[PDB]
């Protein structure tokens, strides 16, 4: 990028040239960084980049002896660039393919049962019986036609017909997508209530199952469904986002259940409970049995039934649907909440204690050891070490406490190369030990020491918490580097460095009308004036960095 | 007009029901001196040989801007469901309306009385109308069955 | 009982018109008789109206030579603060205070006693002299953001200039000390135990929970000390650092704003009004006219029970932003009440309130107050259209010749503020009265109700008004032409019509060859319907979000105007401090931003959150806008105001 001259001299050059420079240093500095922040804070470093992977934490002591115990055996277990030689994508396959054998056999036993086998049959289908009547009482007997497309819209995702690049809005109304044999009707039916010509590629029941990275052991599993298809999978997720919240369970905020899990780790009657690769282990079994036909039918149009692999190799899904589906996050959310409320209902418990975010659950901790029975016969299977009914530990929807104690810890997850990345790193560690801007002494020396590994420049450069990472976490009104132009003062931040891509034009009509188609009481009328669309432009990230000001308000 | 969008849909998607899963509403484009092609809305335009769009002499009273409706290739499997399940449904309809048992095992305990599992059907059996392992089998009679909502109520004797 | 006698007996004291009959009744004929049974007979009144809050009024600086003056006095509603009376009666407190260096309250309370009771017994709101403070120094200044606030410095070794800078500095920043270290030594020991427990609470170690919490302790005892603070027109440099450049010192500073500790009990009109109430034909339904009013008068008079009277006899006869409303057979109505100046103001600038009429309120046993002089002004200074007059309690008024000079009263009030007073409906009715079931009572409420649907007239419909769509972005549809789109803001579109497109760059004109939406194609577009409008000839290149198209010379550009403004307080996620006299924000039309400057009023040198204030801002683009146009006011996202279009300019 332009440019590294000795011409221009302006702080936005040298600011600039100065965040494109690398982070020389030897080794894993990720690791070094970690490490001295264990000794800082009294702890034994990490043997090798496999103990990284491997500590475990001690649920007892100290509330402070915890939390940094638990950010031991978290910050580097999703560190992207390990030596060891793990195959991420090979043992994500393997729990893929493993999970799919799940659903088989939980299929055939949920069809016709084996009464010779080990599962609690009374409960569990006097369980089913229960929250398929609570169910077919929330949603109905058929998703509203209404409803449906009031929520249907694209994704900004890929799909079977176009790549990450292309996945904008715009580019799937241009652009002739894909979509099932049971789907097709809706696409047709569609293409007669408008003018514009709404098109379909090619008709196939295959979806691609692809990979994406989770953590330094296994990556993750998802689907990428067809366009269409997806069209109309979230149409069905919103009328079951709308429903859910009659049972108390808005998808749409994690501060319900984050509130919980610090609840339950002081009054210890709540428990969070985890599940193992739950989205994958959704049978069509228990699809059948739970929700009512002409819902299951709806599901089953627009699901896709087969999905070709990375290797050529198809395989019929035993499972409704993977983690890359429109209604999969809401369906979850559903089947769950039923059969926990139910649950609850059978051991006369409230069952209003009963919060679900998908795949994360929090209960009354009575009831995780019926629960426990009625997911394993459902084959949903419970993972005991991340599940807490007993105990100061809790857990949920990315907050972790420790009796009352917010002991939620960060995590490095790339190596460390440019001046961002690091400003990144150490931002987090701020938000991570300050206390209302107040430095924890023993990671404040740390914290201090590898910030001198940035540009002099970009050490007294600072930015209030809550602008981004764009620039170090402080006390901007300090910021040398900070115009207090127009009684508002700007601060310079990094930035991805973009080249314009010319945008879909008649896709992005497409794109805008049919989005005006699907549509304090002082301060309520002023954002009224604000009219929040935004007009499509599509743009390239170059791995280059830039320079902006932005405004900015010192804190105090 | 309107007729909201929503409203459009759902008759646009009745009247697809009305034909078979393999002929399209498709609209006619451009006819030449030997084949008219259809646009169904799909990739690749299909062609009808002109002829059979003749009378009972010649010429072709058809034209461009005429919906017709065209033949979508067949190209080209839950063995799971295949456990012998939609018989197993139709075994309730037709013993019900013979008036005769089916053999069924009461698994657990309910609301309004206890769940039966009769060939892989969930069904009511309202108690009303001393057990319990391994969920016995028990000759059932079906009183009342709910053809569309997969709801059935079962008698006991 | 002789009713020209009891006219002049108004004057001296503008008494309850009752009052003055009542005064008469006893000890008739002699007027000089009842005025002075009638003074004495007023310390009661004051002491009954000592009860209701008084968390509003003014403060007063005054400074002669090496000594300073600060004041507090408190009235009911800032209707009666803006009123000539009170003023003159907190200035005579001002000067008795520097003149006689009086600091101890109590004294000032005593000595203009008699002055006040005369006062409240012809104004009816709770008068009092809260506190008085004097200072004293080298150098003193004083800074008034207002009447809300009022400062007063000591210095050395400053100007004038640098210390009002350091007055207004303390207005905006409220400062507690002025160094650091004159925190008390013992007091701020109790905040550090606190702060040691929040902190051994997990929490160990003891030497890094200890360092931490002193660590936080000069944080946030460089936050209460003047010296420590960002100075407000230079927040890089700390006041401290200010005063050791100027080589000067603060000896000391006094801060008052109105109402400070005051319990602000907050007022539910709603549910005041709520609680006492109940004590083609299709096509009709939907097109009723919506109409909004608001009731304006002192607060004794009872606006709050006349309101709920007109909710209950319109449910009684016809069957049915804190705002209440009610139906008559031809529209429907939102009543909103307006206990304060600023307050409304507030709203008229948000859009949270907008009245297209207002209903006066006087109690006839009072006749006018000397702030319903203030409530008529108000009225002017927002621009409502037509006020209605309803005289409440007219049961407890004796003689019609009463009621009449009332009229007279009232009709002269609005014709010196050009309000049609000779033809100012007035209905003389009773509200507590029609609360019951007396017919002769709930028919004056009826006819108030005529009024409001004969004299306010039905607002103009946004259909009726000339075509604008504010464009939300351009498209270039190969093979058709250039399409813009966006919700039609007012007037209708039809294809063939012709356009231009206006603001940003040169006004240009073009054809509308088609109304397109999702569902199908138009031929129209109507007001408050989203749609692409085709246009002939004009490339994408040539247009750009924020402009509107208009009908040819509908609507014209324009770089200058005066506005009304208000900017978000702290609490409203607002600016977090003032600005001053080059303020360079962003000013937010219909779909875009566009940069401005602005020119405060004179006499107006810092603006505070949480501001009321008029100013001609000068924006980097012309944009299509007429009188009444709103806008936000942004930093960047970030909304810190809103306004409205006041006055176009050239």
């Given at each position: 990028?332009?440019?590294?001259?000795?011409?221009?001299?302006?702080?936005?050059?040298?600011?600039?040239?100065?965040?494109?420079?690398?982070?020389?240093?030897?080794?894993?500095?990720?690791?070094?960084?970690?490490?001295?922040?264990?000794?800082?804070?009294?702890?034994?470093?990490?043997?090798?980049?496999?103990?990284?992977?491997?500590?475990?934490?001690?649920?007892?002591?100290?509330?402070?002896?915890?939390?940094?115990?638990?950010?031991?055996?978290?910050?580097?277990?999703?560190?992207?660039?390990?030596?060891?030689?793990?195959?991420?994508?090979?043992?994500?396959?393997?729990?893929?393919?493993?999970?799919?054998?799940?659903?088989?056999?939980?299929?055939?036993?949920?069809?016709?049962?084996?009464?010779?086998?080990?599962?609690?049959?009374?409960?569990?289908?006097?369980?089913?019986?229960?929250?398929?009547?609570?169910?077919?009482?929330?949603?109905?007997?058929?998703?509203?036609?209404?409803?449906?497309?009031?929520?249907?819209?694209?994704?900004?995702?890929?799909?079977?017909?176009?790549?990450?690049?292309?996945?904008?809005?715009?580019?799937?109304?241009?652009?002739?997508?894909?979509?099932?044999?049971?789907?097709?009707?809706?696409?047709?039916?569609?293409?007669?209530?408008?003018?514009?010509?709404?098109?379909?590629?090619?008709?196939?029941?295959?979806?691609?199952?692809?990979?994406?990275?989770?953590?330094?052991?296994?990556?993750?599993?998802?689907?990428?469904?067809?366009?269409?298809?997806?069209?109309?999978?979230?149409?069905?997720?919103?009328?079951?986002?709308?429903?859910?919240?009659?049972?108390?369970?808005?998808?749409?905020?994690?501060?319900?259940?984050?509130?919980?899990?610090?609840?339950?780790?002081?009054?210890?009657?709540?428990?969070?409970?985890?599940?193992?690769?739950?989205?994958?282990?959704?049978?069509?079994?228990?699809?059948?049995?739970?929700?009512?036909?002409?819902?299951?039918?709806?599901?089953?149009?627009?699901?896709?039934?087969?999905?070709?692999?990375?290797?050529?190799?198809?395989?019929?899904?035993?499972?409704?649907?993977?983690?890359?589906?429109?209604?999969?996050?809401?369906?979850?959310?559903?089947?769950?909440?039923?059969?926990?409320?139910?649950?609850?209902?059978?051991?006369?418990?409230?069952?209003?204690?009963?919060?679900?975010?998908?795949?994360?659950?929090?209960?009354?901790?009575?009831?995780?050891?019926?629960?426990?029975?009625?997911?394993?016969?459902?084959?949903?299977?419970?993972?005991?070490?991340?599940?807490?009914?007993?105990?100061?530990?809790?857990?949920?929807?990315?907050?972790?406490?420790?009796?009352?104690?917010?002991?939620?810890?960060?995590?490095?997850?790339?190596?460390?190369?440019?001046?961002?990345?690091?400003?990144?790193?150490?931002?987090?560690?701020?938000?991570?030990?300050?206390?209302?801007?107040?430095?924890?002494?023993?990671?404040?020396?740390?914290?201090?020491?590898?910030?001198?590994?940035?540009?002099?420049?970009?050490?007294?450069?600072?930015?209030?918490?809550?602008?981004?990472?764009?620039?170090?976490?402080?006390?901007?009104?300090?910021?040398?580097?900070?115009?207090?132009?127009?009684?508002?003062?700007?601060?310079?931040?990094?930035?991805?460095?973009?080249?314009?891509?010319?945008?879909?034009?008649?896709?992005?009509?497409?794109?805008?009308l049919?989005?005006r188609c699907?549509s304090?009481?002082?301060?309520?009328?002023?954002?009224?004036?604000?009219?929040?669309?935004?007009?499509?432009?599509?743009?390239?990230?170059?791995?280059?960095?830039?320079?902006?000001?932005?405004?900015?308000?010192?804190?105090? | 007009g309107t007729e909201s969008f929503?409203?459009?849909?759902?008759?646009?998607?009745?009247?697809?029901?009305?034909?078979?899963?393999?002929?399209?509403?498709?609209?006619?484009?451009?006819?030449?001196?030997?084949?008219?092609?259809?646009?169904?809305?799909?990739?690749?335009?299909?062609?009808?040989?002109?002829?059979?769009?003749?009378?009972?002499?010649?010429?072709?009273?058809?034209?461009?801007?005429?919906?017709?409706?065209?033949?979508?290739?067949?190209?080209?499997?839950?063995?799971?469901?295949?456990?012998?399940?939609?018989?197993?449904?139709?075994?309730?309809?037709?013993?019900?309306?013979?008036?005769?048992?089916?053999?069924?095992?009461?698994?657990?305990?309910?609301?309004?009385?206890?769940?039966?599992?009769?060939?892989?059907?969930?069904?009511?059996?309202?108690?009303?109308?001393?057990?319990?392992?391994?969920?016995?089998?028990?000759?059932?009679?079906?009183?009342?069955?709910?053809?569309?909502?997969?709801?059935?109520?079962?008698?006991?004797? | 009982?002789?009713?020209?006698?009891?006219?002049?007996?108004?004057?001296?004291?503008?008494?309850?018109?009752?009052?003055?009959?009542?005064?008469?009744?006893?000890?008739?004929?002699?007027?000089?008789?009842?005025?002075?049974?009638?003074?004495?007979?007023?310390?009661?009144?004051?002491?009954?109206?000592?009860?209701?809050?008084?968390?509003?009024?003014?403060?007063?600086?005054?400074?002669?030579?090496?000594?300073?003056?600060?004041?507090?006095?408190?009235?009911?509603?800032?209707?009666?603060?803006?009123?000539?009376?009170?003023?003159?009666?907190?200035?005579?407190?001002?000067?008795?205070?520097?003149?006689?260096?009086?600091?101890?309250?109590?004294?000032?309370?005593?000595?203009?006693?008699?002055?006040?009771?005369?006062?409240?017994?012809?104004?009816?709101?709770?008068?009092?002299?809260?506190?008085?403070?004097?200072?004293?120094?080298?150098?003193?200044?004083?800074?008034?953001?207002?009447?809300?606030?009022?400062?007063?410095?000591?210095?050395?070794?400053?100007?004038?200039?640098?210390?009002?800078?350091?007055?207004?500095?303390?207005?905006?920043?409220?400062?507690?000390?002025?160094?650091?270290?004159?925190?008390?030594?013992?007091?701020?020991?109790?905040?550090?135990?606190?702060?040691?427990?929040?902190?051994?609470?997990?929490?160990?170690?003891?030497?890094?929970?200890?360092?931490?919490?002193?660590?936080?302790?000069?944080?946030?005892?460089?936050?209460?000390?003047?010296?420590?603070?960002?100075?407000?027109?230079?927040?890089?440099?700390?006041?401290?650092?200010?005063?050791?450049?100027?080589?000067?010192?603060?000896?000391?500073?006094?801060?008052?704003?109105?109402?400070?500790?005051?319990?602000?009990?907050?007022?539910?009109?709603?549910?005041?009004?709520?609680?006492?109430?109940?004590?083609?034909?299709?096509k009709?339904?939907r097109t009723?006219?919506?109409?909004?009013?608001?009731?304006?008068?002192?607060?004794?008079?009872?606006?709050?029970?006349?309101?709920?009277?007109?909710?209950?006899?319109?449910?009684?006869?016809?069957?049915?932003?804190?705002?209440?409303?009610?139906?008559?057979?031809?529209?429907?109505?939102?009543?909103?009440?307006?206990?304060?100046?600023?307050?409304?103001?507030?709203?008229?600038?948000?859009?949270?309130?907008?009245?297209?009429?207002?209903?006066?309120?006087?109690?006839?046993?009072?006749?006018?107050?000397?702030?319903?002089?203030?409530?008529?002004?108000?009225?002017?200074?927002?621009?409502?259209?037509?006020?209605?007059?309803?005289?409440?309690?007219?049961?407890?008024?004796?003689?019609?010749?009463?009621?009449?000079?009332?009229?007279?009263?009232?009709?002269?009030?609005?014709?010196?503020?050009?309000?049609?007073?000779?033809?100012?409906?007035?209905?003389?009715?009773?509200?507590?009265?029609?609360?019951?079931?007396?017919?002769?009572?709930?028919?004056?409420?009826?006819?108030?109700?005529?009024?409001?649907?004969?004299?306010?007239?039905?607002?103009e419909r946004a259909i009726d008004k000339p075509f604008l769509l504010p464009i939300?972005?351009?498209?270039?549809?190969?093979?058709?032409?250039?399409?813009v789109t966006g919700r039609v803001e007012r007037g209708i579109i039809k294809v063939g019509e012709?356009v231009?497109?206006?603001?940003?760059?040169?006004?240009?004109?073009?054809?509308c060859?088609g109304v397109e939406m999702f569902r199908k194609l138009l031929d129209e577009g109507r007001a408050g319907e989203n749609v692409g409008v085709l246009?002939?000839?004009?490339?994408?290149?040539?247009?750009?979000?924020?402009?509107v198209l208009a009908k040819?010379?509908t609507?014209?550009?324009?770089?200058?105007?005066?506005?009304?403004?208000?900017?978000?307080?702290?609490?409203?996620?607002?600016?977090?401090?003032?600005?001053?006299?080059?303020?360079?924000?962003?000013?937010?039309?219909?779909?875009?931003?566009?940069?401005?400057?602005?020119?405060?009023?004179?006499?107006?040198?810092?603006?505070?959150?949480?501001?009321?204030?008029?100013?001609?801002?000068?924006?980097?683009?012309?944009?299509?806008?007429?009188?009444?146009?709103?806008?936000?006011?942004?930093?960047?996202?970030?909304?810190?105001?809103?306004?409205?279009?006041?006055?176009?300019?050239?």
């Amino acid at each position: 990028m332009s440019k590294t001259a000795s011409s221009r001299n302006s702080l936005s050059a040298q600011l600039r040239r100065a965040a494109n420079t690398r982070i020389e240093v030897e080794g894993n500095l990720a690791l070094s960084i970690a490490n001295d922040l264990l000794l800082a804070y009294g702890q034994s470093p990490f043997n090798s980049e496999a103990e990284c992977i491997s500590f475990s934490p001690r649920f007892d002591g100290t509330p402070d002896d915890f939390r940094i115990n638990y950010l031991k055996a978290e910050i580097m277990s999703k560190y992207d660039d390990f030596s060891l030689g793990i195959d991420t994508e090979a043992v994500a396959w393997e729990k893929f393919l493993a999970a799919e054998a799940e659903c088989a056999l939980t299929n055939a036993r949920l069809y016709r049962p084996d009464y010779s086998e080990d599962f609690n049959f009374s409960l569990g289908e006097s369980c089913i019986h229960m929250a398929r009547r609570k169910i077919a009482k929330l949603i109905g007997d058929v998703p509203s036609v209404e409803g449906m497309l009031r929520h249907c819209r694209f994704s900004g995702g890929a799909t079977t017909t176009n790549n990450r690049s292309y996945g904008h809005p715009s580019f799937k109304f241009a652009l002739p997508q894909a979509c099932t044999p049971r789907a097709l009707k809706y696409v047709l039916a569609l293409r007669a209530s408008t003018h514009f010509d709404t098109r379909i590629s090619d008709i196939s029941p295959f979806n691609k199952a692809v990979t994406v990275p989770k953590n330094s052991k296994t990556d993750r599993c998802i689907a990428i469904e067809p366009g269409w298809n997806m069209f109309f999978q979230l149409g069905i997720g919103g009328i079951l986002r709308d429903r859910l919240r009659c049972w108390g369970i808005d998808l749409n905020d994690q501060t319900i259940n984050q509130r919980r899990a610090h609840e339950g780790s002081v009054t210890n009657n709540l428990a969070t409970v985890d599940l193992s690769a739950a989205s994958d282990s959704i049978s069509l079994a228990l699809c059948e049995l739970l929700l009512p036909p002409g819902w299951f039918e709806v599901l089953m149009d627009l699901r896709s039934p087969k999905g070709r692999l990375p290797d050529g190799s198809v395989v019929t899904y035993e499972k409704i649907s993977s983690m890359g589906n429109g209604y999969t996050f809401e369906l979850e959310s559903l089947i769950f909440a039923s059969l926990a409320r139910s649950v609850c209902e059978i051991l006369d418990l409230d069952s209003s204690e009963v919060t679900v975010y998908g795949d994360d659950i929090i209960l009354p901790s009575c009831a995780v050891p019926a629960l426990r029975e009625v997911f394993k016969y459902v084959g949903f299977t419970t993972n005991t070490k991340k599940t807490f009914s007993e105990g100061p530990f809790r857990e949920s929807c990315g907050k972790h406490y420790y009796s009352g104690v917010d002991v939620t810890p960060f995590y490095i997850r790339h190596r460390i190369v440019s001046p961002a990345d690091l400003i990144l790193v150490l931002n987090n560690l701020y938000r991570w030990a300050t206390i209302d801007g107040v430095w924890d002494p023993r990671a404040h020396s740390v914290y201090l020491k590898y910030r001198k590994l940035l540009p002099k420049q970009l050490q007294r450069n600072t930015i209030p918490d809550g602008y981004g990472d764009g620039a170090l976490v402080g006390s901007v009104l300090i910021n040398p580097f900070a115009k207090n132009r127009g009684w508002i003062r700007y601060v310079p931040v990094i930035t991805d460095h973009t080249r314009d891509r010319e945008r879909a034009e008649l896709g992005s009509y497409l794109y805008d009308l049919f989005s005006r188609c699907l549509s304090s009481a002082d301060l309520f009328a002023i954002d009224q004036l604000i009219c929040r669309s935004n007009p499509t432009k599509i743009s390239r990230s170059t791995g280059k960095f830039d320079i902006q000001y932005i405004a900015c308000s010192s804190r105090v | 007009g309107t007729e909201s969008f929503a409203q459009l849909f759902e008759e646009s998607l009745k009247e697809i029901e009305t034909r078979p899963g393999s002929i399209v509403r498709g609209v006619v484009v451009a006819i030449d001196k030997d084949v008219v092609l259809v646009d169904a809305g799909l990739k690749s335009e299909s062609a009808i040989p002109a002829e059979q769009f003749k009378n009972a002499q010649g010429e072709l009273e058809i034209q461009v801007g005429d919906e017709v409706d065209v033949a979508l290739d067949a190209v080209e499997l839950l063995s799971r469901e295949k456990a012998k399940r939609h018989e197993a449904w139709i075994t309730l309809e037709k013993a019900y309306e013979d008036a005769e048992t089916v053999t069924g095992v009461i698994n657990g305990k309910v609301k309004g009385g206890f769940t039966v599992e009769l060939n892989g059907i969930r069904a009511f059996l309202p108690g009303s109308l001393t057990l319990h392992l391994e969920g016995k089998e028990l000759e059932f009679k079906v009183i009342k069955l709910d053809q569309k909502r997969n709801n059935v109520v079962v008698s006991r004797r | 009982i002789t009713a020209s006698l009891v006219k002049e007996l108004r004057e001296r004291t503008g008494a309850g018109m009752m009052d003055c009959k009542k005064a008469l009744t006893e000890a008739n004929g002699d007027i000089e008789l009842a005025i002075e049974n009638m003074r004495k007979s007023g310390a009661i009144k004051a002491a009954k109206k000592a009860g209701n809050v008084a968390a509003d009024g003014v403060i007063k600086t005054k400074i002669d030579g090496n000594y300073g003056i600060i004041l507090e006095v408190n009235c009911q509603t800032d209707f009666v603060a803006k009123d000539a009376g009170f003023q003159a009666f907190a200035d005579k407190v001002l000067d008795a205070a520097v003149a006689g260096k009086i600091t101890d309250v109590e004294v000032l309370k005593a000595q203009f006693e008699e002055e006040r009771v005369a006062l409240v017994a012809k104004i009816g709101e709770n008068i009092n002299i809260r506190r008085v403070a004097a200072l004293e120094g080298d150098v003193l200044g004083s800074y008034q953001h207002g009447a809300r606030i009022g400062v007063l410095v000591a210095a050395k070794g400053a100007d004038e200039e640098l210390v009002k800078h350091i007055a207004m500095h303390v207005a905006a920043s409220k400062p507690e000390f002025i160094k650091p270290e004159d925190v008390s030594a013992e007091v701020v020991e109790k905040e550090y135990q606190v702060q040691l427990d929040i902190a051994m609470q997990s929490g160990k170690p003891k030497e890094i929970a200890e360092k931490m919490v002193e660590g936080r302790m000069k944080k946030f005892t460089g936050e209460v000390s003047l010296t420590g603070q960002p100075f407000v027109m230079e927040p890089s440099k700390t006041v401290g650092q200010l005063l050791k450049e100027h080589n000067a010192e603060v000896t000391g500073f006094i801060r008052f704003e109105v109402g400070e500790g005051i319990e602000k009990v907050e007022t539910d009109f709603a549910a005041e009004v709520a609680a006492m109430s109940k004590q083609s034909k299709e096509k009709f339904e939907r097109t009723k006219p919506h109409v909004n009013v608001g009731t304006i008068g002192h607060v004794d008079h009872g606006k709050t029970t006349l309101t709920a009277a007109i909710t209950t006899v319109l449910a009684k006869t016809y069957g049915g932003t804190s705002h209440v409303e009610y139906d008559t057979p031809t529209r429907h109505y939102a009543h909103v009440d307006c206990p304060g100046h600023a307050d409304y103001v507030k709203n008229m600038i948000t859009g949270a309130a907008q009245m297209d009429g207002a209903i006066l309120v006087v109690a006839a046993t009072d006749g006018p107050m000397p702030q319903t002089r203030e409530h008529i002004l108000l009225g002017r200074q927002v621009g409502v259209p037509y006020i209605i007059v309803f005289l409440n309690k007219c049961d407890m008024v004796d003689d019609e010749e009463l009621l009449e000079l009332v009229e007279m009263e009232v009709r002269e009030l609005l014709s010196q503020y050009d309000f049609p007073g000779d033809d100012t409906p007035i209905v003389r009715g009773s509200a507590l009265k029609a609360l019951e079931g007396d017919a002769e009572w709930e028919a004056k409420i009826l006819e108030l109700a005529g009024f409001l649907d004969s004299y306010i007239p039905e607002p103009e419909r946004a259909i009726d008004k000339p075509f604008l769509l504010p464009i939300e972005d351009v498209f270039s549809i190969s093979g058709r032409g250039t399409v813009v789109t966006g919700r039609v803001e007012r007037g209708i579109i039809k294809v063939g019509e012709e356009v231009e497109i206006v603001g940003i760059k040169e006004t240009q004109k073009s054809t509308c060859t088609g109304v397109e939406m999702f569902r199908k194609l138009l031929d129209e577009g109507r007001a408050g319907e989203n749609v692409g409008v085709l246009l002939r000839g004009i490339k994408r290149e040539e247009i750009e979000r924020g402009q509107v198209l208009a009908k040819p010379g509908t609507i014209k550009p324009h770089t200058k105007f005066e506005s009304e403004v208000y900017i978000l307080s702290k609490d409203e996620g607002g600016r977090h401090t003032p600005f001053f006299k080059g303020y360079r924000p962003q000013f937010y039309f219909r779909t875009t931003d566009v940069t401005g400057t602005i020119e405060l009023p004179e006499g107006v040198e810092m603006v505070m959150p949480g501001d009321n204030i008029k100013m001609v801002v000068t924006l980097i683009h012309p944009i299509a806008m007429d009188d009444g146009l709103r806008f936000a006011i942004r930093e960047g996202g970030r909304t810190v105001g809103a306004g409205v279009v006041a006055k176009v300019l050239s």
